[PDB]
Amino acid sequence: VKLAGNSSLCPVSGWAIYSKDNSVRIGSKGDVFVIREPFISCSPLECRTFFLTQGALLNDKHSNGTIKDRSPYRTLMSCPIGEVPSPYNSRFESVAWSASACHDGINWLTIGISGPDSGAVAVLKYNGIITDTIKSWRNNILRTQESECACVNGSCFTIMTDGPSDGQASYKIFRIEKGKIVKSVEMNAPNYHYEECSCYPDSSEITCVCRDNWHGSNRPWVSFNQNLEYQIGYICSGVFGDNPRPNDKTGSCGPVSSNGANGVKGFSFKYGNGVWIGRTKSISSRKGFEMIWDPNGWTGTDNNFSIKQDIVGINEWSGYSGSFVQHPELTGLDCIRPCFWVELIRGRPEENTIWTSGSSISFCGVNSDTVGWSWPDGAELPFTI
Amino acid sequence: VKLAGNSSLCPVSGWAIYSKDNSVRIGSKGDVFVIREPFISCSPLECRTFFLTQGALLNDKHSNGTIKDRSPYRTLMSCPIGEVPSPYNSRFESVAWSASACHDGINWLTIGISGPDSGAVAVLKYNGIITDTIKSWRNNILRTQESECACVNGSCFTIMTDGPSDGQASYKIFRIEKGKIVKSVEMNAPNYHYEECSCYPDSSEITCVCRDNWHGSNRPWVSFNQNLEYQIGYICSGVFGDNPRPNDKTGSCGPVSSNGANGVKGFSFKYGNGVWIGRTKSISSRKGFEMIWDPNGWTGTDNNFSIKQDIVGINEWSGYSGSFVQHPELTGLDCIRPCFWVELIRGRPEENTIWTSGSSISFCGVNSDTVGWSWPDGAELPFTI
Amino acid sequence: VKLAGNSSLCPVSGWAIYSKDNSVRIGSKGDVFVIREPFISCSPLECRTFFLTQGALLNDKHSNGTIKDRSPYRTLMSCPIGEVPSPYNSRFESVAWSASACHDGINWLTIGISGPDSGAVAVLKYNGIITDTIKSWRNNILRTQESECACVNGSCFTIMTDGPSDGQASYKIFRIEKGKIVKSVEMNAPNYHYEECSCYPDSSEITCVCRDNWHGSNRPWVSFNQNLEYQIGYICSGVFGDNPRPNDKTGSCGPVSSNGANGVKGFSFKYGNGVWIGRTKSISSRKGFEMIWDPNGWTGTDNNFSIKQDIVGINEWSGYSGSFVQHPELTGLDCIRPCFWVELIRGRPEENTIWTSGSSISFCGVNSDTVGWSWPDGAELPFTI
Amino acid sequence: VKLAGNSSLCPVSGWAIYSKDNSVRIGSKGDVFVIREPFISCSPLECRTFFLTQGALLNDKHSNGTIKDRSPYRTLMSCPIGEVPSPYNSRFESVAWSASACHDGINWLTIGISGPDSGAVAVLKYNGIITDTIKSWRNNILRTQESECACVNGSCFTIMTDGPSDGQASYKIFRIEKGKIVKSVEMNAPNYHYEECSCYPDSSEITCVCRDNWHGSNRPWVSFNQNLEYQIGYICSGVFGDNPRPNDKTGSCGPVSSNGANGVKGFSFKYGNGVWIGRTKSISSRKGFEMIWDPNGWTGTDNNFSIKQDIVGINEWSGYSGSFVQHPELTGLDCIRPCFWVELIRGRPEENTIWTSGSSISFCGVNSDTVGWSWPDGAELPFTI
């Protein structure tokens, strides 16, 4: 059966920890991959964790210099949620250095980009069979969401970027039906930057929250229906979500350019005028993580919020964060439940090692009593390599 | 398709060894988890072993100081019975430092407690989906059975404790239907201590034998129906149950306080006025194990018994002990078969290592010819690390 | 649907290699068990290899002194045919130091003996549930076939021995229906010895060829119907079967006491008056293996034969040998196909190591063109331990 | 339902990266086999990778001298596509040093040759059961395709060679129906050499492209219907196929003998008069790989082509190459899709190691936009052994 997306998003007041993966603690002795960008996607029977292996095992000589991110060895794989990425319990999905995966209620769809920086090619697979193929239209690094896409009524929607990472790029929205592209629309967004977007279906409509890697320290968004009729803007809130970001002050609808020249992959949930902002705790480095509920944070420019929940302590390393969705066909409720994941990066950029790998944690929103704590990666670096 | 639980408990005269796990012998070279409290639960198709990993492998540098029991890295996992807990053959269940799991004949229910000591939160999962959530009441260490619960007619019953571990705590009984809490009742038991209960169904009723960690050297019990109408007391037999216990003498129906200040998790089966007491051979440390049949132990205060069976030698290390049952929907008989498991702890508290891990053995009650022997953990400590 | 054993045994003229296990070559780096007596049993869907793990991994410090054969750590496990006995791909069956397993077309039956020498107890499991239990009746040592048993209709037939290994013991035949013993008969065989039998069904009758560890260098046999009406004797051929055997000469109908004081587990197939003898190439040590077709070997005492096939070279180590059967419900033919397995022992009793482990090979009987070769264990001893 | 063939080969204009396993650069730490001659075969549900293990793990003392390609330890195994060949995730198929496997839409058929050089015997298995067995004729090294065969209307067709590898051999075509050899025809091809052929079905007929190991630097071919009515010849193109080959010039319809003393396993697809030649970039050693589209290459002797795609760089090691097919019963299209695989050999023959192992990559043909790149093996030799 298909996967309808006509039911609105569940209102939540807290987040309960779903899964925790101890990849780097177990990888000092066991055989686990050196992974990056570990997003989670769910199916009407189970939820899988998708990661981008670098072709090497942890605590090995082939994990040297894994700060590189575009090599002919990166592959997309998947393992059951909560389990370490290992060669003996992972499933091969595609060969890619940028990827995304979804389930339309019948079969898995995976998009994977692999090729030269000028002329990369995206290969679409439906049930493990190549169905369609895209090529770069502006001859720069072609990127995908790095997260799961949104599938509504049997059609799955993704966003791809092509162009400079510090200038004006080109943005495209795709509608995919059973692995074949049936409609693509190029966004007309001058003075905007969309990159590594997190998309969820709400009311037969798709909402994506992206990162501005050029001149924005808040987060842009785009919303479109099944005919790809889009609306663009930024999240107007004093609770900035990007990293690096300035200290909290009055935001604006336009790209706020105070400390916005890079970013980290993030997300947010729209609840009318409110937002559930998930950001780090350090305005300079990727340290800590927290959840903030701003009652009027989607259109009102002030730094006042209502609820804050602690997820990772301010002294513990953090990284990419994205959002996934559990449909009523799986949970059994009458609405769509929001969930999210966080990646805990530990390695070369900020520590004196030769590699770079990240563990993951996952939370799901509930209407019950929840507590805030710190669930970090308890690895003891450096390793023996 | 759901478990009825309306049959009486099978009368037995002996115990036949069901499974044995050589986790620590194999973990010196292989990749196995550092586990603790490995209870067992059965389903209408198979029986699983549930353990609480610390997030590190045996013979690894991350197994240092695993005598700690409440950390953000402890997770609940499960593996098929008789198999070593390994990253490559285990299934992730929940994130918890105190957990219990059950099967109501349709789907698996797992309760998992994780959070701060003052404010811990229990997350209930039905078929891998978060369904309900509980929070601590008295803001002390919220703890659960550490063993499987009892499911009768589609409802599963558990007991949770909240308060001092050497004083008067608060005790609660829960009824769970398809992951949602339907009814909770707070026990009114002055001068009692209930902790780490082992519950089994018998004639549509639930009986739990718990651990008195405050002033009792015998074991308390509680019995309730599906409406949570409870009866409380102590197992008044001269054959004491806890590990720090006096030499055998006339017991009492109230808490006997001679050597009882820090118990160990155990069990017992009621057969009218009789009991099947499972205890350790040493009254000082967790060494040895045996099963004793007292014909009038549940109500008569004398130290005379009838049958004793040897399960672990007096010079071999022992640990936690709990009880599980096999329903007629699985065995095919007309009554509920009693079974139990023992954990064999090897590590820091009594040996000169840096870690603490435990293997397990299992026994099933039969009406045939059985022998008493010693089935210890044949590990040779210390390890390389 | 249950297995019927009414179709006669297939006439064959050669043996084609079925599977080969490189357990010891792979176990120098990988994690494989230290196994012994690796028999094979088939099911209407697949064939499994059953072995007796000793609780330790190969190339490990717990492999010291594995020449011992009765310890509380030995367990019966199973893995798919042709695959190494690894902890990550094996299934736990029972706790035993002497075991056998069978499939009656519906579910797996496993018998496992574990306990003291004087008082060992056999635990019968049907579909993983304990169903019946036997105790030693002469209180010396309780042994089983170490191979698969014969299943006709829903009943499976095994032979158990109890008594001296160098004197006169007591012999019993069991009929098992759905895990429960329905009829047992004690053999009256003065001046005979049956220790490790290989049983196959032919025409709704069961024939077992056993080991004489007291008198004879030839092999005894027993044949019985479903009511346990047995016939006893010895294989009257000049082509002797046991490993400590004399040079070929005229055989005898009773125990030939020339070099018969020990023995090795073996087999033979009856074809009227003919036999398919599987023996070792060395009359003093367990080296080499071959299959010999004697047209009148079952009753005619002469050393002349017709066909010989080489399976292991005379300079390569060999060991236990047994026979299994592929029923028409699996192969699809109209008769029962003969098959056999060989164990290749490498370790302490003949080499300068600290351990003792064995690999396995399998052959199937065919009416096509086949070749004789040597398929030994290519391990390079000693290891690094 | 059985595969039908019955449809023509899909016209393609490019090749999309399908799978890639990083076996050699994961086996430096993990446990992977020392494999050689991989190939991929697809079933109506999944595609498997078949390899010929040498009985030893990578980075182990038993990897010494893994260049002897005919030993009694080589076995045929299979693992899911894109996954490393490991003892814990691969299935045993047969014992062979020369093998091929196929799926007729119902069950897997595997052919495996193992035995002496003069007297090797091929064992045919259907659904894991030995069904037929065939023996050598000219008492030389009996070879099979080393690739998947072609199954049309429930019958699978293979080619075997027997005779000198530098002279005139004997070639045979087999039709196999449910594991039993139905019809065999001996090819009458004087002054031809057929070896290691790659066969695909097209319009209910079989076309095979082989290697000439005696005096040809181009590639021979053979095409036959279901009654084994064959047509023989050579690929008449100036774009030569074998690895030892001269510089491009006008080809010939016979065995062009310039540098044809040896060869490497390869393939080609016929599209009327055109060819899709897959060859290496180095005319002396096995380095690089590319696909070339010659519009009239099958019959027109000129060196002009129209399309070239880069798959491995000229400075990266390459090896065997073969072709497989995805039927409409799996993809869902209306025609047969062509795909191919490449093996990346790294080890003793060309580098200063003690072993020889190869990774693999796979491509499938599409009518979309594709890019040429280099997807080599990123191993860093020598290892620690």
Numbering used by the authors:
A (entry chain B), B (entry chain A), C (entry chain C), D (entry chain D): -7 to 377
Quote what the paper states about this structure.
IAV contains two glycoproteins with different functional roles; HA binds to sialoglycan receptors and mediates membrane fusion, whereas neuraminidase (NA) is the receptor-destroying enzyme that removes the terminal sialic acids. The sialidase activity of NA is essential for virion release from (decoy) receptors on host cells and for virion mobility through sialic acid-dense surroundings to reach functional entry receptors.
We produced soluble recombinant tetrameric NA proteins stabilized with a tetrabrachion tetramerization domain, validated their quaternary structure by cryo-electron microscopy (cryo-EM) single-particle analysis, and conjugated these to Mi3 self-assembling protein nanoparticles using the SpyTag-SpyCatcher system. The structural integrity of recombinant NA antigens is of critical importance for inducing an optimal immune response. It was recently shown that recombinant soluble tetrameric NAs, particularly of the N1 subtype, may suffer from structural instability in the head domain, resulting in an “open” conformation not generally observed on virions. Collectively, these observations indicate that our NA antigens adopt a closed conformation similar to the presumed conformation of NA on viral particles. The antigens were produced in a mammalian (HEK293F) expression system, affinity purified, and evaluated for purity and size on SDS-PAGE.
